[PDB]
Symmetry: C3
Subunit: 269 residues, 3 copies
């Protein structure tokens, strides 16, 4: 796969697309939870050579626009994109579940604590500008889930559904990794899946990003000590806890703070 194809403006999407390539979707039927404006669908179809891509989104206008972008960005593969229409939260319509049940791989880069602070505004404008062009939501809470203790409730809710509807399907998801890979792997093991980390990158966190959640979390987990994972350099050589990274920023407003993003595949037994 060539370098040009991975999103060059958003490291999270880039991390997610380099992992989808490594996942090996060629000839498979894939389902994307949260297609948005379909750029990832175009990528999976044109670059990963997926046989069939379906998907849905919470906002029901996006399916229309995803199709449009796919026709424009992957015209020779566009006929293989069959979105599920409607306002679909996770996979919660009969239509969505039917297609999920027929999928080999379910993929998603889903809301989570630690996501870029501007991702919602971005997503919203993105819609509009395409929704002709040529406010919700509402991004739910999923507070009941055990792994919402580390900000991953929505991702756990999806795994509960995937296991039930498509028990033999892989599930490939993108994650901020400040809580560490043991926690990330536990999310999958708790829910019937063997995790494999397909890919990871050190990414720059936007200036002014609030990391108070991660500082509080690592205070709560000490008894060996648990520490959140941040980095002081883009090579990820200088390690920092949430507390040290916040301390750095308290001093120098312009301090560069880095963290990992990584794609993990869950595979059932």
């Amino acid at each position: 796969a060539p370098e040009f194809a991975f999103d060059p403006t958003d490291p999270w999407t880039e991390t997610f697309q380099r992992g989808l390539e490594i996942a090996g979707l060629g000839g498979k039927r894939v389902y994307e939870v949260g297609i948005g404006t379909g750029i990832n669908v175009a990528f999976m179809l044109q670059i990963c050579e997926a046989a069939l891509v379906s998907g849905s989104d919470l906002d029901p206008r996006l399916a229309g626009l995803a199709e449009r972008n796919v026709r424009d960005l992957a015209p020779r593969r566009a006929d293989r994109f069959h979105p599920v229409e409607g306002a679909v939260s996770l996979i919660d319509t009969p239509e969505a579940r039917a297609q999920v049940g027929r999928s080999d791989v379910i993929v998603g880069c889903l809301p989570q604590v630690g996501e870029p602070d501007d991702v919602r505004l971005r997503a919203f404008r993105t819609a509009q500008a395409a929704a002709l062009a040529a406010h919700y939501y509402p991004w739910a809470e999923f507070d009941s889930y055990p792994f919402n203790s580390v900000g991953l409730g929505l991702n756990e809710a999806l795994l509960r559904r995937t296991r039930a509807t498509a028990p033999a399907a892989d599930v490939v998801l993108n994650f901020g990794a400040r809580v560490g890979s043991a926690v990330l792997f536990e999310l999958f093991e708790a829910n019937g899946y063997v995790p494999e980390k397909l890919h990871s990158q050190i990414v720059l966190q936007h200036a002014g990003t609030d990391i108070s959640f991660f500082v509080a979390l690592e205070n709560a987990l000490a008894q060996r000590e648990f520490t959140c994972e941040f980095y002081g350099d883009p090579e990820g050589a200088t390690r920092l806890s949430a507390t040290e990274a916040q301390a750095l920023v308290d001093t120098d407003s312009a301090a560069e703070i880095y963290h990992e993003v990584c794609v993990i595949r869950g595979r059932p037994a």
Copy 2:
């Protein structure tokens, strides 16, 4: 057959069961009590077979007599499981649940009517009197009705730990069976649906009714839900579903609801009760 407008929670449950499509099915009810729902499911719903159990060991025998009177024709077709059965936690109960197409229940939950235990007490001793026994006041279950072991459940945070506990058991023991449960909906329909989705079931709301909550009902539990933080310690949006009118047109938060009763202690406050069927994939 009258519905008894005195007990809207039960009326909602039974209307839901009628809609669940139990005809020719084999049903297990968790918490049979004196068997009124059993008789309803046999006589009105036309279930092929009904079984069930109760935490109070004295109720299966009493329920057995009672359905005989209530539904003399099809009073067999009812085979209760004996003993003090919590949820379905005996080998006889599990064996019957494994053979059932549908498990139904109107189970203890935060937000249940405050007079629910007194009503069950009175219903049992009424039943024992119709059966011809002049008994002592031994128609009340004592400690057990435990809550502690259900406290760890994710959905215990919204008062439904016991219901989630049941879903863990029904999925394992009868992976193909529907589970049809009655709920007070003060915590919201979306939360009630997540209870099923989180545990392997696709929920469908069979029936719902707006019901008036008793004047002295404390609702600070639901107010606290609206002020609590997420598990993350970050602020959370959470709005409970109350209403101001018996048609359910005026919506009210728990905070809003508690304001009115602070203003006018006599104010009427309503909420939804709904029957939700969980269906496995």
Copy 3:
């Protein structure tokens, strides 16, 4: 068929309880996997006393599989050929090798870390993964690591029994719910009253008694301690701390018990 009293561990009442439950479990002729093999004594016990057909297992520390192998060979030479440990640093069963073995096992067994374990077990002299299991619903009673194992055993070996050793200060209703919440029908195979080491911290259990329910909201809950060794006189966790306060050397007891979780099935 004499009771093999000689064979049970005389040194550790927790291990003694485990082994007594393991003989009651009926492992004869079966394929058994032990999480946390340690030195291998339990394996030797299961081979030589329980007549397991085959035994495998793993430990978090990769230098212990070899040591276990050594002691199984020295303690059960004529059965040690039935021991096939999984090498490597294996947390729970989280390698492909471990997983393949578990999937072929009739029974998974373990005496796993948990809040309330003796303070000295940690020391070796021969946890540590822990934070990742903080989110489990039963970590509220200090059993999150055990809950994590039950999530894996159900998925990897949905037909296998799981036999686990437990301190029962939180009481048997809670211990049984850990299994019922996770797809297993529990059965208490064996239990004993043990003496907790003078000076053991039970702040955790006192906190459980003074806690508002998750709701929450009132919660009436009492831990199970004992004042004697026959478990005749009951004590709450608060009452037990109170005594340790009155006496530095007050003797405090609690139950240890072995529970088998059987899928249903």
